[PDB]
Design an enzyme around this catalytic site. Structure first.
Site, PDB file in Angstrom:
ATOM      1  N   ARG A   1       0.844  -1.198   0.000  1.00 54.77           N
ATOM      2  CA  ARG A   1       0.000   0.000   0.000  1.00 54.77           C
ATOM      3  C   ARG A   1       0.881   1.250   0.000  1.00 54.77           C
ATOM      4  O   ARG A   1       0.523   2.225  -0.673  1.00 54.77           O
ATOM      5  CB  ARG A   1      -0.931  -0.002   1.236  1.00 54.77           C
ATOM      6  CG  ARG A   1      -1.898   1.175   1.146  1.00 54.77           C
ATOM      7  CD  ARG A   1      -2.837   1.226   2.294  1.00 54.77           C
ATOM      8  NE  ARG A   1      -3.488   2.509   2.462  1.00 54.77           N
ATOM      9  CZ  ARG A   1      -3.524   3.217   3.608  1.00 54.77           C
ATOM     10  NH1 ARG A   1      -2.926   2.898   4.762  1.00 54.77           N
ATOM     11  NH2 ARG A   1      -4.262   4.317   3.553  1.00 54.77           N
TER      12      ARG A   1
ATOM     13  N   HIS B   1       0.681   4.269  -2.760  1.00 53.63           N
ATOM     14  CA  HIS B   1       0.364   5.659  -2.379  1.00 53.63           C
ATOM     15  C   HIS B   1       1.426   6.682  -2.780  1.00 53.63           C
ATOM     16  O   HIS B   1       1.078   7.847  -3.078  1.00 53.63           O
ATOM     17  CB  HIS B   1       0.122   5.739  -0.870  1.00 53.63           C
ATOM     18  CG  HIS B   1      -1.304   5.524  -0.480  1.00 53.63           C
ATOM     19  ND1 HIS B   1      -2.017   6.354   0.360  1.00 53.63           N
ATOM     20  CD2 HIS B   1      -2.171   4.545  -0.871  1.00 53.63           C
ATOM     21  CE1 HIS B   1      -3.229   5.849   0.536  1.00 53.63           C
ATOM     22  NE2 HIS B   1      -3.346   4.765  -0.199  1.00 53.63           N
TER      23      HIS B   1
ATOM     24  N   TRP C   1     -10.545  -8.455   2.972  1.00 49.55           N
ATOM     25  CA  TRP C   1     -11.177  -8.831   1.712  1.00 49.55           C
ATOM     26  C   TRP C   1     -11.310 -10.345   1.522  1.00 49.55           C
ATOM     27  O   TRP C   1     -12.094 -10.791   0.650  1.00 49.55           O
ATOM     28  CB  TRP C   1     -10.341  -8.225   0.592  1.00 49.55           C
ATOM     29  CG  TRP C   1     -10.454  -6.739   0.455  1.00 49.55           C
ATOM     30  CD1 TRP C   1     -11.395  -6.037  -0.266  1.00 49.55           C
ATOM     31  CD2 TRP C   1      -9.572  -5.747   0.992  1.00 49.55           C
ATOM     32  NE1 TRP C   1     -11.154  -4.680  -0.202  1.00 49.55           N
ATOM     33  CE2 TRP C   1     -10.045  -4.474   0.547  1.00 49.55           C
ATOM     34  CE3 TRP C   1      -8.419  -5.833   1.784  1.00 49.55           C
ATOM     35  CZ2 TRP C   1      -9.413  -3.283   0.883  1.00 49.55           C
ATOM     36  CZ3 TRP C   1      -7.803  -4.650   2.128  1.00 49.55           C
ATOM     37  CH2 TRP C   1      -8.264  -3.398   1.685  1.00 49.55           C
TER      38      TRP C   1
ATOM     39  N   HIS D   1      -5.934  -6.023  -3.336  1.00 52.15           N
ATOM     40  CA  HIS D   1      -6.897  -5.999  -2.234  1.00 52.15           C
ATOM     41  C   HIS D   1      -7.086  -7.374  -1.624  1.00 52.15           C
ATOM     42  O   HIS D   1      -7.807  -7.507  -0.623  1.00 52.15           O
ATOM     43  CB  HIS D   1      -8.263  -5.342  -2.475  1.00 52.15           C
ATOM     44  CG  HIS D   1      -8.115  -3.854  -2.309  1.00 52.15           C
ATOM     45  ND1 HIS D   1      -8.884  -2.858  -2.797  1.00 52.15           N
ATOM     46  CD2 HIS D   1      -7.040  -3.226  -1.793  1.00 52.15           C
ATOM     47  CE1 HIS D   1      -8.402  -1.676  -2.448  1.00 52.15           C
ATOM     48  NE2 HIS D   1      -7.225  -1.866  -1.875  1.00 52.15           N
TER      49      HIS D   1
HETATM   50  C1  HEM Z   1      -9.817   2.855  -6.180  1.00 56.71           C
HETATM   51  C2  HEM Z   1      -8.578   2.578  -5.843  1.00 56.71           C
HETATM   52  C3  HEM Z   1      -8.296   2.215  -4.365  1.00 56.71           C
HETATM   53  C4  HEM Z   1      -8.983   2.584  -3.276  1.00 56.71           C
HETATM   54  C5  HEM Z   1     -10.211   3.508  -3.180  1.00 56.71           C
HETATM   55  C6  HEM Z   1      -8.325   1.962  -2.133  1.00 56.71           C
HETATM   56  C7  HEM Z   1      -8.704   2.169  -0.837  1.00 56.71           C
HETATM   57  C8  HEM Z   1      -8.076   1.485   0.169  1.00 56.71           C
HETATM   58  C9  HEM Z   1      -8.482   1.639   1.562  1.00 56.71           C
HETATM   59  C10 HEM Z   1      -9.628   2.612   1.949  1.00 56.71           C
HETATM   60  C11 HEM Z   1      -7.708   0.837   2.295  1.00 56.71           C
HETATM   61  C12 HEM Z   1      -7.655   0.570   3.812  1.00 56.71           C
HETATM   62  C13 HEM Z   1      -6.669   1.376   4.637  1.00 56.71           C
HETATM   63  C14 HEM Z   1      -6.728   1.134   6.123  1.00 56.71           C
HETATM   64  O1  HEM Z   1      -7.815   1.431   6.716  1.00 56.71           O
HETATM   65  O2  HEM Z   1      -5.669   0.648   6.624  1.00 56.71           O
HETATM   66  C15 HEM Z   1      -6.816   0.134   1.383  1.00 56.71           C
HETATM   67  C16 HEM Z   1      -5.913  -0.798   1.801  1.00 56.71           C
HETATM   68  C17 HEM Z   1      -5.010  -1.407   0.963  1.00 56.71           C
HETATM   69  N1  HEM Z   1      -4.800  -1.043  -0.354  1.00 56.71           N
HETATM   70 FE1  HEM Z   1      -6.161  -0.109  -1.528  1.00 56.71          FE
HETATM   71  N2  HEM Z   1      -7.239   1.232  -2.580  1.00 56.71           N
HETATM   72  C18 HEM Z   1      -7.206   1.358  -3.943  1.00 56.71           C
HETATM   73  C19 HEM Z   1      -6.287   0.794  -4.782  1.00 56.71           C
HETATM   74  C20 HEM Z   1      -5.214   0.046  -4.411  1.00 56.71           C
HETATM   75  C21 HEM Z   1      -4.106  -0.364  -5.250  1.00 56.71           C
HETATM   76  C22 HEM Z   1      -3.968  -0.025  -6.748  1.00 56.71           C
HETATM   77  C23 HEM Z   1      -3.299  -1.083  -4.485  1.00 56.71           C
HETATM   78  C24 HEM Z   1      -1.963  -1.797  -4.841  1.00 56.71           C
HETATM   79  C25 HEM Z   1      -1.792  -2.105  -6.138  1.00 56.71           C
HETATM   80  C26 HEM Z   1      -3.850  -1.137  -3.145  1.00 56.71           C
HETATM   81  C27 HEM Z   1      -3.308  -1.833  -2.098  1.00 56.71           C
HETATM   82  C28 HEM Z   1      -3.792  -1.880  -0.821  1.00 56.71           C
HETATM   83  C29 HEM Z   1      -3.393  -2.790   0.231  1.00 56.71           C
HETATM   84  C30 HEM Z   1      -2.339  -3.902   0.064  1.00 56.71           C
HETATM   85  C31 HEM Z   1      -4.126  -2.503   1.307  1.00 56.71           C
HETATM   86  C32 HEM Z   1      -4.073  -3.159   2.713  1.00 56.71           C
HETATM   87  C33 HEM Z   1      -3.076  -2.395   3.604  1.00 56.71           C
HETATM   88  C34 HEM Z   1      -3.063  -2.832   5.046  1.00 56.71           C
HETATM   89  O3  HEM Z   1      -3.496  -3.972   5.344  1.00 56.71           O
HETATM   90  O4  HEM Z   1      -2.596  -1.935   5.803  1.00 56.71           O
HETATM   91  N3  HEM Z   1      -5.037  -0.450  -3.112  1.00 56.71           N
HETATM   92  N4  HEM Z   1      -7.053   0.559   0.104  1.00 56.71           N
END
Ligand code: HEM
Length: 293
Positions: A47, A51, A190, A174
């Site tokens: 993540r 970002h 997820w 995700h």
């Molecule tokens: C529409 C595009 C996206 C949205 C709206 C989105 C939104 C989010 C949100 C709201 C979280 C949770 C954060 C938290 O509360 O810790 C999250 C977690 C995460 N995102 Fe996405 N994300 C998007 C795209 C992506 C992309 C493109 C990647 C990597 C290629 C990604 C990888 C991750 C990962 C691995 C997590 C889990 C992190 C953890 O467990 O701390 N996301 N994302």
């Protein structure tokens, strides 16, 4: 017109130098396994790499991974970056050990390492990002919202030059980690294997019986009886016809997904960067396991 960001190899470092940074990140992943109830830091690192790269604007070439700007307070305190300070603190000790690596190179390498150590595909990686001044730090508000539809998603990703296929491939990240109420106002994983890189995201999407409900942050999420969740933006992948056929392909072929992810991930990480023809080819790091470590 548009800034130009030429990649510049860290003076006198080669492949072997980078492999050592990779191995250090990897050994720490292995060791600090208790983080987030035993999920480990893998997911937060992925993540983080997304970002720091996602602020890119193909219109004036600002943002992207090049500058390592996340190091500055403005980007660091981006509300959309809440919870990333954990990936940051994990990498510090490493940076202290290998002070010659630029920030952008470290942040992005963390992402590659996490994916590969979590049994994902190999992601070719390129060095050369150069720390830029605090004034090149992009303003907050370039990262996407979760409460939107397929149209928003398509439009958004367009700013990063990603097409439909790229968007769906990248979203399969995700399968990792989970939402944290305190961070984003969303709660739940997820899937079940959230520290192993698989096509699980797509299967859950197709196969669960999702119920729209509001969470304690008073946001809507799709909840499954298995105890999983999907964000509106995730869900929208099955609402759009173009998206849904890709989801299906991925649910059906993990190999396909791995290949697509690999390309899209690298692309994402290299957006906004110009690589001179003399620049070294992309490196492919060995995992700990491949080195017998
Ligand atoms: C529409 C595009 C996206 C949205 C709206 C989105 C939104 C989010 C949100 C709201 C979280 C949770 C954060 C938290 O509360 O810790 C999250 C977690 C995460 N995102 Fe996405 N994300 C998007 C795209 C992506 C992309 C493109 C990647 C990597 C290629 C990604 C990888 C991750 C990962 C691995 C997590 C889990 C992190 C953890 O467990 O701390 N996301 N994302």
């Amino acid at each position: 017109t548009p800034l130009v960001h030429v990649a510049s190899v860290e003076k006198g470092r080669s492949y072997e130098d980078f492999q050592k940074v990779y191995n250090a990140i990897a050994l720490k992943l292995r060791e600090d396994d208790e983080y987030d109830n035993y999920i480990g830091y893998g997911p937060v690192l992925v993540r983080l790499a997304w970002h720091i790269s996602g602020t890119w604007d193909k219109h004036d070439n600002t943002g992207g991974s090049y500058g390592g700007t996340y190091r500055f307070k403005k980007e660091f305190n981006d509300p959309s970056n809440a919870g990333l300070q954990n990936g940051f603190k994990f990498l510090e000790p490493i940076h202290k050990e290998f002070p010659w690596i630029s920030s952008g190179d470290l942040f992005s390498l963390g992402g590659v390492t996490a994916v590969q150590e979590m049994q994902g595909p190999k992601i070719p990686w390129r060095c050369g990002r150069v720390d830029t001044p605090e004034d090149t730090t992009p303003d907050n508000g370039r990262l996407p919202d979760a409460d939107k539809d397929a149209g928003y998603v398509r439009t958004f990703f367009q700013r990063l030059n990603m097409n439909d296929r790229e968007v769906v491939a990248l979203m399969g990240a995700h399968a990792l980690g989970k939402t944290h109420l305190k961070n984003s106002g969303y709660e739940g994983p997820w899937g079940a294997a959230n520290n192993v890189f698989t096509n699980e995201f797509y299967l859950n999407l197709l196969n669960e019986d999702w119920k729209l409900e509001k969470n304690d942050a008073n946001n809507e999420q799709w909840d499954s009886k298995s105890g999983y969740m999907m964000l509106p933006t995730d869900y929208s992948l099955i609402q759009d016809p173009k998206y849904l056929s890709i989801v299906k392909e991925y649910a059906n072929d993990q190999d396909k997904f791995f290949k697509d992810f690999s390309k899209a991930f690298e692309k994402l990480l290299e957006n906004g960067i110009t690589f001179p023809k003399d620049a070294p080819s992309p490196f492919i790091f060995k995992t700990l396991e491949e080195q017998g470590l």
